[PDB]
């Protein structure tokens, strides 16, 4: 079990309303980690307490190749710290920004890994993620997907159990969430649809700057694809982006299993996906370990610096 001092603070990785994320070296071990440092004041003040707890709990009982692991989690008078595996590869949002579009093969690979991760969360942990977006998908040193940021998860969601909470990111919301209907775990598939759409198409499948106009598109406009998109890719995206959740690929009792069987994924051996036996299509090219290429210069070129939370503190079992 640890405190603020057991770490050296090497580089800034992001700054936002709720805090910052520092690349860190752990003194006792030499292992580099990513520290999310939240300002307790802000969390309580911005009402983000319940979400923060949810993230602690979700990370604590999930261990998966493609979900960000959590090593330690602790506190101070003014701070909540999450100490986590470093995604050297930065956000998928970073790479798309610069390449425009990914090949189908490369999108297939990232999508298999997301499907593996969302399946584990649904079937093994009874969790619905709810916030699938490019920003939330990172790459590790090898170029495997890492889903980060679990504060919007819903827990104890078994089979067709349904939720009411209006949350996510506007551009990514499922039609059933927009209808203000009850909704089930199929919302994650709508999301997988969107990120996979962006990966292969280079744009979002629905977009206006005005939320209400964006929401109409999501509810009313049927999808359209670039004319170069192959039929299996096109069928997958159509199935994932059905507005009716009961028609969505992944929407039945089969869940993930329905997507795993789709012709788009014909080549894939799901057990090799999980075991990282597949050729990642992109290894992040870092000279060293505090190389922060794939993180914004706005952040990486900077110099670094109220109640108690019951049972917040946690260390990763050996």
């Amino acid at each position: 079990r640890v405190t603020m001092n057991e770490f050296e603070y090497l580089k800034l990785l992001g700054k936002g309303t709720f805090g910052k994320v520092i690349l860190v070296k752990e003194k006792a071990t030499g292992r580099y980690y990513a520290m999310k440092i939240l300002k307790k004041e802000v969390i309580v003040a911005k009402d983000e307490v319940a979400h923060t707890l949810t993230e602690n709990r979700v990370l604590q009982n999930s261990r998966h190749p493609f979900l960000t692991a959590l090593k330690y989690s602790f506190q101070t008078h003014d701070r909540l710290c999450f100490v986590m595996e470093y995604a050297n590869g930065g956000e998928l949002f970073f790479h798309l920004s610069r390449e425009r579009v990914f090949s189908e093969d490369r999108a297939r690979f990232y999508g298999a890994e997301i499907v593996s991760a969302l399946d584990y969360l649904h079937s093994e942990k009874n969790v619905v993620y709810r916030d699938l977006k490019l920003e939330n998908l990172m790459l590790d040193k090898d170029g495997h997907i890492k889903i980060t940021d679990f504060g919007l998860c819903k827990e104890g969601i078994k089979d067709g159990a349904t939720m009411k909470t209006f949350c996510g990111t506007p551009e990514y919301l499922a039609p059933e969430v927009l209808e203000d209907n009850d909704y089930g775990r199929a919302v994650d598939w709508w999301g997988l649809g969107v990120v996979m759409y962006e990966m292969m198409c280079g744009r979002l499948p629905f977009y206006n700057q005005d939320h209400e106009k964006l929401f109409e598109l999501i509810l009313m406009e049927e999808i359209r694809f670039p004319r170069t998109l192959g039929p299996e890719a096109k069928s997958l995206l159509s199935g994932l982006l059905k507005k009716d959740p009961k028609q969505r690929l992944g929407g039945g009792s089969e869940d993930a299993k329905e997507i795993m069987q789709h012709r788009f994924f014909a080549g894939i051996v799901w057990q090799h996906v999980y075991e990282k036996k597949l050729s990642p299509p992109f290894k992040p090219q870092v000279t060293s370990e505090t190389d922060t290429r794939y993180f914004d210069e706005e952040f990486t070129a900077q110099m670094i610096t109220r109640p108690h939370f019951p049972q917040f503190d946690y260390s990763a079992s050996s």
């Binding site: 979400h51 949002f93 798309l96 920004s97 425009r100 916030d131 977006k133 920003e135 940021d149 504060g151 919007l152 909470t165 209006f166 949350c167 996510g168 990111t169 506007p170 551009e171 990514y172 962006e198 280079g202 744009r203 979002l204 977009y207």
Partner: peptide
């Protein structure tokens, strides 16, 4: 690409 997006809740 597009502008960076914000996660919210209500």
């Amino acid at each position: 690409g597009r502008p960076r997006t914000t996660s919210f809740a209500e």
